Every structure is written in C-alpha cells, then in structure tokens.
Symmetry: D3
Subunit: 306 residues, 6 copies
Amino acid sequence: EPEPQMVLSPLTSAAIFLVVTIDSGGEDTVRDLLSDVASLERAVGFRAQPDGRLSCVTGIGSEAWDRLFSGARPAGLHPFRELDGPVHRAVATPGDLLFHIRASRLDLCFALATEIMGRLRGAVTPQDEVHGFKYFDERDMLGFVDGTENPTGAAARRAVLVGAEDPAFAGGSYAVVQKYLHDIDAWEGLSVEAQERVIGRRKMTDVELSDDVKPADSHVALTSVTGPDGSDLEILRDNMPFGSVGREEFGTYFIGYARTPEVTETMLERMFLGTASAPHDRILDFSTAVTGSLFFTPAADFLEDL
Amino acid sequence: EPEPQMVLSPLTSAAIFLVVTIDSGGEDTVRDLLSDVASLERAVGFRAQPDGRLSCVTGIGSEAWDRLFSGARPAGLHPFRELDGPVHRAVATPGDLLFHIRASRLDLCFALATEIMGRLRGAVTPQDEVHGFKYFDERDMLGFVDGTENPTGAAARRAVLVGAEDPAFAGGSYAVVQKYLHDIDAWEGLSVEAQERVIGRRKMTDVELSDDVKPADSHVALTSVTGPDGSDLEILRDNMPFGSVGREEFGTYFIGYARTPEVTETMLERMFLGTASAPHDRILDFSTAVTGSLFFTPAADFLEDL
Amino acid sequence: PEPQMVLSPLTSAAIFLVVTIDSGGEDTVRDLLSDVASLERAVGFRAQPDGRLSCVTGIGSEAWDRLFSGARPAGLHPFRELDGPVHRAVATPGDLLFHIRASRLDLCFALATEIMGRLRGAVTPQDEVHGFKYFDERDMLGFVDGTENPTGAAARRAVLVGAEDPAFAGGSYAVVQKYLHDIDAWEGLSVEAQERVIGRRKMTDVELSDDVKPADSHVALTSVTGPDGSDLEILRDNMPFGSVGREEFGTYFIGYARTPEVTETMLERMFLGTASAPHDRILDFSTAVTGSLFFTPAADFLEDL
Amino acid sequence: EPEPQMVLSPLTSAAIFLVVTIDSGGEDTVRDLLSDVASLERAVGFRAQPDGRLSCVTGIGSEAWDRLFSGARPAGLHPFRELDGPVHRAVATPGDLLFHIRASRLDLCFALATEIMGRLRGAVTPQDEVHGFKYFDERDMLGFVDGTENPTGAAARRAVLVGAEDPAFAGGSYAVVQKYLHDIDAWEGLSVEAQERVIGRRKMTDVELSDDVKPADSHVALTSVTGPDGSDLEILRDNMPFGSVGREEFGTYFIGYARTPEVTETMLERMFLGTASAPHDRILDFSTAVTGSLFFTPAADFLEDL
Amino acid sequence: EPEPQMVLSPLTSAAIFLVVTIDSGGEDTVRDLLSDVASLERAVGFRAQPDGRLSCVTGIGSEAWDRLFSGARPAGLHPFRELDGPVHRAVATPGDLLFHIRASRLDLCFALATEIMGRLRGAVTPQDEVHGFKYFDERDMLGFVDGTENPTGAAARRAVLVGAEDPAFAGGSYAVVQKYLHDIDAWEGLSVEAQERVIGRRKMTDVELSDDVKPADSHVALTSVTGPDGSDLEILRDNMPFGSVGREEFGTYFIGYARTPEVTETMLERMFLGTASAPHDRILDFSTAVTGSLFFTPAADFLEDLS
Amino acid sequence: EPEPQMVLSPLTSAAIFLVVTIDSGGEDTVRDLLSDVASLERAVGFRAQPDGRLSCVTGIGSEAWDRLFSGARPAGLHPFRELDGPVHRAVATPGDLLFHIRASRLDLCFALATEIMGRLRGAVTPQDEVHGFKYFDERDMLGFVDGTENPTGAAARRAVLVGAEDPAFAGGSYAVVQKYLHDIDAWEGLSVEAQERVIGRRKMTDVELSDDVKPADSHVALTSVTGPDGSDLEILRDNMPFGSVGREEFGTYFIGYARTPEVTETMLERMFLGTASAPHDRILDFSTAVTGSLFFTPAADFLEDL
Ligand code: HEM
Ligand code: HEM
Ligand code: HEM
Ligand code: HEM
C-alpha cells in the first residue's frame, strides 16, 4: 500500500542534483511545494512520453525534518556523520532538501528544476547544483565502468526500501550524497594495471579481479560487506560524472540509497577509517569528498497527504 | 486470475477508432471474429517486435450484448445517455462494436483493421472511422498537453478495471467515445492567458494553475470529482487528435475508460449541465460533440471462450 | 538556381493537397507562394534533427496564365485525358499542388494548416490525402514500390529542367493520380499471378527475368527506352492511403520528370497499350479517380514574387 | 520467492547459442564458472545499460547433472529422447552445458561468450556454436513470421516456470534445442499457397488459416496440443535464423522452453512419428535436425549458491 | 580547393564553448596544438562513428594572430568593437582562442575539450566555459524557437565562407560570440502577445508576424538587413541555451558565422544603437551581454599546414 | 563523370565478405550477374530505407579479368604478391570475385548474398565467407579503435578513385583483402602500455602517441608513408572484426581501397619485410594472415554496360 518514490529507478544519461537549505520562515513555502512535487513532475514529464524517463526523488535532512513536521521521525534519520580518518576525511556540509532529478535529456531535468526552484524562490538558499552526464559506456571520470554490481529486482527492493523495521515510514529510503573531485594528474600517473588494483576490476572489460589478485585495500574489497547472518549488505548507487575543463574539475557525484543509513555508513567507515588489513580505500588517494549530506526520501503518499 | 485487454496500456503515436453496427443476421460472423480478435492482433503485431506496441481493445454496446450473448449482463452496461443542456448537447449515435487500435505506427493499425473489417464484411455497417496522430509534445488541437493527469499503476488499475462489485465481468471496463470538432478560429481569437483560464493549466509548460487563480468553470475544475469517500474519481483517457485541413476539421477523438460508467457520466453531466458554480464547461464553447456511444470492453478470456 | 525538395527521398508520412483558385483569389495565392518557404522553416525547424519536413509547390497550366505574366514553361499544359478501350485516365481540376512530406504526420498537418489558413476564402479544396508508409516500403498491392527510382546524378538529369528551358531551369513537372484498388479481386489471385501482373517477385522484390516477364506487366510497360539507347526515367513518391470503412485502399501516384512527355509516354503505354499488350494489367485492379499536371518552379522563382 | 533466469525475456536481434561437453576432471572449473556466470553477465551488460538487453540463460543436461551435483534431481530431467520415425529422424547429440546468450547487438553476445569460454578453456569441449540474427520482420529462413503464438504475461509464466509440482527447483525451466538445416531449393519449388498449407498460416500477413482449410499435417496443426484439462499446452520459442551462403547453409536454431519436457516431447512425437490423420509434419520434408539436446535451466539463485 | 572547418555544420543537442587567452611565451605550445586539433577530433569522434557528429571549430582573435603568425592577415580580422548605446552596451572581453565543440552527446564534447586543454595547460588562461543543451523543440530560454531563419545549402555557403575577395584565406569564416544572461522574472511578467511583439514571431507556432503588425523595435525587424544590392545580409547562428537554476542564471550563448564581420556588426549596431525608427532592440531589455569577442576561423588546411 | 561503386561510403555495423573462384565454363553466368548486381542491390536495399544503408562493392581479380573481358586492362591490376619476410609471411590465396557487402543490419547483407550466390550457383566455387560485426566503440579484436585515420571528403576521393592516370577505368579502385587471425592469449599477456607501443596509439582514448615515444616498429609508424611531394600516401580501410569463440578464432578482416595498389603494397612490404629501422611490424607478432587477394573494383557504369 505504501507507494515508494522512484528510488529503484535505473541510471539515466542526464541528471541534476540540487541541495538547498531552508531559510528561517520558509517552512510553509516548503510544505506547499512538497505536496506539489509529484504533480510538477507529471506536468513536465508527460510532454516527453514515452522516452523522457523524467523522475524526481525528494529527500529531507535530519534538522529540516524537525522544522517541517511533528510527531514520529524515521528511526535512522540523523545528520551526516563526519569521519575524521588518519589520512582522508569525510566532511559534513549543510543541506535540508535534496532533489535528485533524472531524465534521458537534460532539458527535462532543467525544466523541472526551474519549476521547483521557482516555487521555492525566497524560502531557500542553494547549497549545491550539479549537472551530471553519462560518460561513454557507463564510465566515471576515473575511466572505469561504475554501477555494475547494483542490485536488481527483489534484491534491490530488499536493500533500498524501509519495511517492517520502521512500519510508520515503510516505502521510504535513505540517500547519502557526496560530491567527489578527482586528482586526474596523480591518477593518470598510474599504469592501467595499477589503477585496476586500486579499483579491483579490469578497466576495459569491467571484469572483476580474481580473489587471489584483488588487494585488500581495493575499492571493491572494502565496499564488500557481509552481515552477521552471512548475507550481503547492499546499496543502490546512481553516481554521475560532472566537471569543468577550464577549472580542471573532474568529479563523481556519489549518491547511495539504502533502507538504513547504517549500511552506507559501515561502507564509509571501512573506506575512511580502514580495516585491520587495509589503512584506507586507495580510491581516496585520488578522490576528495567536498560535500556530505544524509536525507530521508519518504514514500510518495507521505508528500501527497501533506 | 482474469486477463484484461490492453485497457491500461499507455498512449501511442498512432490510433484507429472504428465504430460499427451489426446488420441483420450478423451475430454469428461477429461471434467468430470476437474469438479470433486476439490472434489477429498477434498475427500483425509480432511482425513489428519490439517497438510496434500494437494493441486492439474491443467494446460491445448494450443493445449488441443481448443479441450476442445469453446469460449475465455487465451491471453498468446501458445505452449512452444523451444530455440536452441549456446551450450544449451531448448527442447519442448508433454503435454496436468498438475497435480501439493503437500502435507506434499507423501501418500496423491499418493492417489489423483491414483483417478485422475483412472478416466482418457484409455483417456490419461502418458508423465511424478516425485515424488519430500524435501532435507534437502530446498536444491536442487546442494546443494544450493532453493526458497529464491520467492515473498510473495501482491507481489506474483501481479506477479502470471491474472488480468484486461484478465478479462475473472482473477485468472488464467501460468505454465512452465522443468525436469532438473544434472551432479553431474562435479559439485563436482568445489570448493564451484566456485559453489557460478555459483549461485550468499553463499552455506551454502544462503546469496546473494555482487553486487561487483557477476558475471554477475551467475544464480541470469541472472534471475534478470526489465521491462520498472523499477520494478522487478518476478515468483513463486515450484521446487522440485528428482532422482534415481542406474540410476545416480539427478534432479531438475522446475515449475514457472507467470501472463504472457512472464516473464518466458524472463528469459529462458537470460539463454539459453545469454546477451551482458554473453554467457549463468553457471548453464546450469551442468543442462540439458529433458522436456519443458507450461500450463494455470485456476481459480477454471472455472473448476467447466463445 | 535553387530547386525545390523535388529530389528528396520517400518519407514515412505525407499530405497531398490539391486546390483550385477561386476567381479574385489570384493576389492571396501570390503572397502565399512568396511565403511558402518561410512557412516550411517555421514548422520544420521545430524538429530540426530528424523532422525532414519539406513542401513542393506545383502550379497548373491554366493557373499559370492567371497568376503570372510573360514566360511559360515549355511543357506546361493541362493533363491530357486518355480514353482507352477498357480503362480511362481521367483529368480533374487542380491549380495548386502542395506535396508535403515529413517523418511525422504532425509536421505535415501543421504546415498544411498554415498554408490553408492563408488561402482560406481564396481557394477551393479538390483533394486531400494523408499518406502513410506501409511496412517495408510497400504499396496496397503488397509490393515494394519505388525500387527503380533514379538516384544521384541520374536523378538530377531525369527530374530537373536544364538548358532546354533556361528561364525555368531547376523546375520540374509533377503528374498526380489518385488510384483506388480492387483488393477483393487482387487478393483472389495467387502470389505467382500477382508477380506476373507487376513483373517482380512479391516478397524479395527481385525483378523477373526477361524470359519469364509478361509483355503486359507493369514493369514491362513502364520501362521505356527513348530515341537513343538511354532509358527514360521518372522519380516516384507514391504513398499508400485508405479507409477500411469506405473500402478505400489507394495509391497516390506522384511522378516528377524534366519533361511531361516522359510521364505521358508511360501513361499512354499503360492505358492505350502497345503492339503486344492491350493495356497495363495493373489497371485491372486500379482505377484513377484524379488526374492533374503541375509545374514545380525553382525555389528562387517563388521567393522573388 | 525464487528468482529465475531471463527465460521469459523476449526475442532479440542477435543471439549466440553455445553447447559444450564437460571433460573428465573439468567439474571443478565448471562449478566455479556457474557461480560467476551472473556476475560476468553484468560485467559486460552494464556497459550498454539501456538498449543492450544482454542476457545469458545457462542450462545443464541430465548426464552432466549427476557428474556435477550431489542431491535431488529435477523431476523431468532426462537425456533427449531420440525419435526414429518411418521417414524422418530426430537425432540426439551430446551436450552438457547450454549457453543461450541474447542481446540487441552481437558484440555484447560475443564478448560474454569470450569471458565464459575463457574461464572454461581446457575443461570443456565445444560441440555447437551458432550466431543467430533477426531476419526482416521476425521471419525464419522459410520466409514465414516465426514466434507469433508465443504465450505472454501470466500465461507464459505458468507454461515455462517450474512451480509447486517440483518445489526444490521452482523458478527453473526445461530447454530443448535442435539445429535445423533447410532445403531451400526444394522449398522455393513450392508455390506460396502450397507453402502456406505446410505451415498453416498465410505467408505475407502471418494470418492463421481457417480450421476448415488448414491441413491436418500442417506444422500449426501438429504443434497445437490440448491436455486432459482441455486447455492448450504451450511452449516458449526463441528460435533464431542463422546460416552461411557459400556452403548453402540456411538454418533455424530451435530453442523451446517449458515447465515440463513432456509438452515439448509430445509435440516432437506428433511431428516425427505422426498422428492418426497425419503421417508426419510436412515441415520436416524441408528441414533436417542435426542436433538434439535437453537441458534444465535452474533458478538464478541456484547457480549463485555454488 | 580549400577545406573549410565544420562551420556550415548544423545545430546539435550538445555544445561546449571554450574561450581562452594565450599567456606570455605560450605561442609555441598553441601553434603545436593548432596543428593537431583535427587529429584530436578524429581520435575522440571515430569512437561514435555513426551518430556522434563530433566537430570542433577553432577560432583565432586579432591580437593573437599577430603573435602566432608572421605572414598576411585576414582582411576583416580586428578586435570586437564595443558598443556604448544610451541604454545597452555590447562589452568587449578578452579572448584569443575559441573552441566551438559540438556533438549529439555532451561526453564527446567534454572528452575533446579535456584533450585540447590538457595540451594547452600552462600556455593558456580560461576566460569562459559554457556547456550548452538543446531545450525542447529548438527553443531558447525565452521560450522561442531559435535559428529558424538560418540559411541553408548554397545560400549558407555564400553567406559564411570567405571567397575571392580575400583569396589567401578562402574557406575561412568570422565568428562573433556573446554570452547573454536573461531576466526571466521580468520576461515572464509579459503576456505571450507582448513577448511576441519583442521577438517578431508567434511563440508556439514559430510563424513570423505579419509585416503590418510587426513592431519596428522587434528583434526580427532590427536583425533584418538588406544590403546596397537589395538582397538580404545573412549570418549562421548556432545559439545554445545554458544555465544554473540555483544561481538563477538563464542564458543564450550567441555565436554567429559570416564571411565578413561587417554583416554581424551592422546587426549589432542596429540592436544596440537603434535606427531612426527604433531606439534599440527590445530583446535587450531582458538580455545582458557579459562577453563579446571576434575570431577568424581559418580553413582546415591552414591549421594542418602549420605542422 | 564515371560513377564509382560505394568504395567511399563509411564503415557499417554489419558486413559480409564473399570471395569466389569462377569455375571452368562459368564465365557467361558471371557476366550476366555482374550486369544485374546493382539491380539486386536496389531490390533488397529499398526495403530498408533509409536506415538500411545496404551497399555492395564487386571486385574482379587479375586472372579472372582476362577470362571475362576482352580489350584494355586496368593499369595496376595483377595477382597479389606473396611476401616472404625473415619472420612473417603474407600468403597469396585464390580469388576471382570479391563481394564486399555492408549494411546496418546483417539480414540485408545476408539477403543480397543469397541472391548473388543463387545466380552464380554452378558457375563459381566459394573460397572465403566472413560475417563482420562492429565491436563496441569501433574497436578491433585487439581492443583498439580501428579506422581512425581513414581519409574523408576530397582527400578520400583523391586517394581511392582511379583518375586520369588510367582514363578508361576512372571511378574504379583497387581492393586488397587479408584475413588475419589473432593470438589473443599472447596479446593479453602484454600490459596495456606495451600494447600501445605495438599499435602506436593510446588504447582507451585512441590518441596517437607523440613522435618521441612512438617506436619505429609500431604499426602506425610503419604504415605512415610519405610520397614524392611530401604528402602522405593514404588508403581507405573497412576493417571488420569476426570470429568464433568455440574454435578460438578472433580475427580482423582487412580490406583496403586505393587508386593504385603500389600504395597498399608499399605498406605491406614495410610491414612484412621491414625497413632499416624496423625488423617488421610488431602487430604481426600477434596476427597471422591466412588469405591474400587483390581485386579491381570498376566504376558502376562499367558493370551495367555488359
Ligand atoms: C496504380 C498505381 C501504381 C502502382 C500500385 C504501381 C506499383 C509499382 C510497382 C510495385 C513497381 C515496381 C517497383 C518499383 O520499381 O517501383 C512499379 C514500378 C514502376 N512504375 Fe508503377 N505503379 C503505379 C502507377 C504508375 C504509373 C501511373 C506510372 C507512370 C506514369 C508508373 C511508373 C512506374 C515506373 C517507371 C516503374 C519502374 C519500372 C522500371 O524501370 O523497372 N507507375 N510500380
Ligand atoms: C524446422 C524448424 C521450425 C520452423 C521453421 C518452425 C516454424 C514455425 C512457424 C512459421 C510457426 C508459425 C508462427 C508461430 O506461431 O510461431 C510455428 C509455430 C509453432 N511451432 Fe514451429 N517451427 C520449427 C520447429 C518447431 C519444433 C521442433 C517445435 C516443437 C518442439 C515447434 C513448435 C511450434 C509451436 C508450438 C508453434 C505454435 C503453433 C500454434 O499454436 O499455432 N516448432 N513454427
Ligand atoms: C539575446 C540573445 C538572442 C536571442 C534569445 C535571440 C533569439 C532569436 C529568435 C527567437 C529569433 C527568431 C527565430 C529565428 O529566425 O532564429 C532570432 C532571429 C535572428 N537573430 Fe537573434 N537572438 C539573440 C541575439 C542575436 C544577436 C546578438 C544577433 C546578431 C548579432 C542576432 C541575429 C538574429 C538574426 C539575423 C535573426 C534572423 C532574422 C530574420 O531574418 O528573420 N540575434 N533570434
Ligand atoms: C592485422 C590486422 C590489422 C589491425 C588489427 C590493424 C589495426 C590498426 C589500428 C588499431 C590502427 C590505428 C587506428 C587507425 O587509424 O585506424 C591502424 C592504422 C592503420 N593501419 Fe592498420 N591494422 C591491420 C592491418 C593493416 C594492414 C594490412 C594495412 C595496410 C596494408 C594497414 C594500414 C593501416 C594504416 C595506413 C593505418 C593508418 C596509419 C596512420 O596514418 O596513422 N593496417 N591499424
């Protein structure tokens, strides 16, 4: 009965990521938009039926939630936990509202973004805006295929959607966003085979490295987490490349959905704080997190009945 | 589990609407076709996998039903109710069988209709035939995006399909057809802003007017209905533009699917008869209905079991 | 001299529009004729990538005299009616031809709306046809249609007016005929019998060998070798159209050529026959309902008006 | 609950069928591959995330099953039953593993096949390899639309997927393969009308012949089978054209899926051994089977737990 | 027979515009890149051979030409002329090199820009970078179809390519670039009718307004220019929308190609300074130019035969 | 202006290469086909307008020319010259007629090939048949983008088409074909960087190595040839990948067009025999030529006038 947002939807060739903070006194303007967001999506999206694939996923931060609503909160909703590791650091930056906008064409994303921000003008301060674009055969700026091991079907729904563990918010999800910038100069100084050891997959063919060759400090190794019951802990990632050539800015916009933030945070902890066998994730030697925010994306019904 | 026809299927770029009456002694020939209609659909349709999206929905009129079938009747099935309003009239016209044919290309539509009419030749009289075509970004002849607020998924299934309320005809639906002709001269006499107030939405962006600005005699206002439940009463529209430039025919072929004809009929009444708030729908000052028929579209199984 | 899109390939959608000019409508028509190209751009640029919208404007012989003063295209005359022993190629009124093509019907309809909107009260519509592509470039008889159309340089020489009439160089002559087919009769024949009528294999579209091809087949009759060794050629943009209810299953014939003599020779062979053929066998399943001849001038001619 | 392989997925424009036998001492390598087969599918397939439609269905033969797994056997799993008819013979040929690889592009098929064979090198002996291609409007080498009467939706699910009757192997399916070479010289000696009477459908339009003109030895007649219930027994066919012009090879690669092999075998017996009214299937007068193998295609999660 | 750059190439769904100045002592690194620019294009472009449509047009500014080259100069090459009108100004901003990169996908544009800039690092300073995107049915941020009256075929060739009037630079063109930011708030205050009067064409249908009702201060009227002959002066425009929603930036990146800058400059003059009939172009009441540069785009041969 | 065959047309995603020898006494049948080849091309091709992009280039060998035609010979037509290098060897294999068939779909290629061979059956013997397919982003089986430096426009015309040097055959061209099989095992034993030194270009980005890094025995170095005036001698290559996973066949089908064979032969000599600076082409250490034929491809009007 709880109808989820488009959190299970596949990766698209264009995306707009939009993070704002709510100005004091903006609450009411924000509530009005939240109840219209699905309506605005249809209004723009319908024009490009059937190949438009326009979707918007709306997320609300921990502090924003308390300003907007009264009563019970999602069980795991808290501000992004800053991770201060020996070498690398995962910062928390401000963000009350997330708009994850996806389509097969940028114009659709931009048109929807304009409609949303038009209604929010004077109530919100923009914190981050990223226009994501598909890079060749689903590659990131590091030149590796990105998103291969994303869950599908029942597994995707099992890993992503809040269920009976928090029944009042069933159909919701948790999104962690991090804007990463890459040091391409240092990355390109590595041989392809060395880069492969950093990731844990073959560069060209996207084939996973054998369990023999794959280093303990490789990205694939550290982000592979098993639960106490032996099951794999999974997240759904909709990462998109972005960048500016003149500024020498080459980035991955990280976004990860999971039914509990504990799954995503365990992965982050392994990456930044390391394990007993790895000091940290080698990918972080060529990647710097510049933002960090956590949002709860409620069921579609929740926004409607508001 | 009853198998419905393609009544929940989305809008396509081409369409053929075919309305016929059954001649004297034509019952047997019609019964034979009805049992073969799905196979005829596959015979043509499979030639254009996967992008063809050929479908045919077959409807049977109230009078026609009793000539064709012994036993139970669908509970809602009756002849279309003519509405003689103070200024605007919803006419009723003859129609025994409906063929609503859709595909991404007209050739597929035309080929199926050829096979259908081939099998019915000498048993039926053609009443109406319309070839519909997608007009730009899902627009109608009035220049507005048309079909934005159609229900989807669970909401659509609930609004369109017969359920427990008539168990013998579960998976069926009721179709109302009306061929509307538009007075484009008069319409293009109005400013865009004046047009927007007629419809209740913005012309280019298809964004709904604020409730503050939205007139009560706007099309959107009049066709927005709530039951004693307090929930929205919804229909599924597969409207298509048509016309001939030389004959000054600029048309909307209206087709609405609902689980009970009462829903569609209520909307019709509000449009032609008006409420306490409005004398009639302003759209009708630019739209003249020239046909009007009601059909029950059975479950796919029902057709095969003949 | 810039020609019209007369060499453009076949599209998946077309609108054919034939009108007569009402007396006193001369001036309205002239102003439209000067605006037709910018009207095309107005609609077509909206689908700039893959819309492929074009409009070829044709003017009739009688209309030419009423509209313009001075030089006449040499080969411009009314459509010559052919009263054959069995079949007739009728002549019907038509002053203006609008041959509108695009990859989508919406683009065609929009342009036609704009044209007729300007011409309203100055013209009377005679014919309007909405053409659609039928499977793998097939006509209503179920055969691939347009295979032997000239291409490239050969197309240019066959279609475009050259030095023979230098005042109208880059123009062309368009012959239109709406045909209705007897599908009940046609579907009676076996495939092999149908192939003998056309002169090609039905499914594969392979031309029958000269050893097996009947003298009264469409291909044999429409293959014309002129005074020299050169074959005479026309460019056809035939489109299927119809209505299942009215039992209309049609082919809208349009053929472009440098001189109408080429088209007329083929037409005579079809209706009046030759030495070893009474008439084109296709005509036993095909009836012409319209017949008109237009000159389609260079783009610059229409512009400088 | 059980997650099947892409056994229900539709026809694509490119396919690779790979049939191998397992060498002595190659069981270890085969098991290790079978556990990785799904990840290899993703490694190649994610590269063309939209449009790609890369899938691989892995099947295991009877003899191979006993060599490979210790435990319960799928109830219907047995070697292909050779049929020695009075005129036509259905040969049984060796085959331990089936790889049914499909995509919208051959490169994806070839790439995945390379990765699979690269892992299996020196553990398997290749028996058959066929590169299938779509031919015009879903036609076979006989010039007839092929696949028309395939079940879809729920009907497909019930006909193809193993259910409660064999609960330990729920979500599995049975695949029967046969490579056919056609005698095109003989075939193109018949008139179209005569060809139609062999198949049971019109050639150009793919419209089924009426039952009162359809011969009893036509392909459609003999492959139409009803059970004790009175309902139709159905299989899902993904057969693909293939061939080589220089060696006069014009072929149909037959692949049929069913929830029980008894269905496919019944239709094979009728074709080869005939019925009361029909000596054999007239299609075999122009078709020769050179291979014949039967495989069980387990649920996806069965392969993964190795 | 000189080979032009893809200057006559049509509009695409994605573009990158890159404007840089050459630093002191950067001349040799630049000259070296200019010789490999075509080969860099093929290196990236061949990967999407079918429907990629990757192209790069390289332009060189007036001051930069004297620094790079020793021989003759194109006859019409000069710095962008600033226009100080009573109300509106057309600014001249620094820019030595122009890279007009187009494809059907942004990734192709970004891959080529990465290669170009990678070779030019330390030698050049970025001035402007815009990533352009198609907006619906070829619309601009004002919501009007943009490019309709672009010349095609022979007429385009005659309008854009340098010919016999300057035979040593035949197959070249002149490109004028201006980045415009729009005041959407103000624009959306106008009715559709009122907006139509600013532009000179119907909004949705893109049909040109009738001559009797088309205002003298409309965009279409002011940029309609007949020469001394009586024939129309024409330019080829590859305008692309761009913007940032959060920063409230809604822009049109203007680029016009012409065989001589006099054509484009005349149009500019009519827009900014006005005529006897019109004070200025009304579009400028909602559009602010923030960049302005002029470049000569040489024939491909010129760039290759630098070696 | 003599009309050329489609020797200038671009690379397609599908290709069939057909090489046959003319049987004793099959000359008359060959001449009749040659006059109908363009007609056959249109017969199949027109069915798939406008995306089909079907074309067929017909070539005639040296020895075959003398059997077929009386009168003048193309100036540069001769048998393929075997190259017996110190290490590698370019074999000469029999070939009278080349059919180079390309389209966006294999079906069109296969259909045309069928028609051609159907007419030549009993008059010719097949020597070679390859079905080519596009591999990812125009890559070859070595994993490098293949065809990057092909000339285009006027440059291609001057490089490929016979001109005034041989007036009677203007519009014609010369095709050299070589079927190469690759040793993939060995090639994948090299690092990416080593592979780059073999080819002379970066692997993923396809950017050419600078002159101070590019080895003299690299493929790009050895196939770069300057002529008398100092301008590069160029060929047009339409290389297509092919292969069979079962038989470990991973191949490049090499075809090169040039206005004179001298150009293609110089490159071949440099590759196989070597220079003072280069023992041989390093690509040959991973590539074996198994066929080798030279053909003249006449202007189109030459074929029809027969
Ligand atoms: C009744 C409507 C007509 C139909 C259904 C029809 C159909 C066909 C077909 C199926 C072909 C063979 C495929 C092709 O090359 O296009 C063909 C060829 C041709 N038709 Fe028609 N046609 C019609 C009317 C006409 C008329 C009126 C003319 C002449 C004025 C004409 C001239 C030709 C020519 C010149 C060819 C090519 C013959 C060759 O050189 O091989 N057709 N037509
Ligand atoms: C020689 C290779 C074969 C060819 C060329 C062939 C071709 C066809 C064609 C053209 C049809 C009609 C279109 C359709 O419904 O798919 C058809 C139907 C069918 N074929 Fe085959 N077939 C072959 C082998 C087989 C075999 C071996 C089986 C069974 C094991 C089989 C089972 C069926 C079934 C069940 C149908 C559907 C019949 C109906 O219910 O109407 N086919 N086949
Ligand atoms: C402020 C940014 C601008 C916008 C949004 C804009 C938009 C438009 C629009 C909507 C049209 C009508 C449709 C068309 O034919 O393309 C147009 C026409 C035109 N614009 Fe602009 N324009 C801008 C700036 C300029 C500038 C700076 C120039 C000259 C340097 C220019 C030259 C033209 C020309 C020559 C035409 C065609 C006029 C005709 O002959 O019909 N535009 N522009
Ligand atoms: C063994 C099979 C071959 C493979 C896999 C192969 C592959 C390649 C590759 C990857 C390139 C660089 C990208 C490009 O510009 O296309 C290339 C370039 C080239 N190849 Fe080959 N090649 C083969 C055989 C040949 C042969 C036999 C010739 C001539 C007889 C040849 C002539 C050329 C030429 C002229 C170039 C362009 C060099 C330049 O100017 O940069 N190739 N080839």
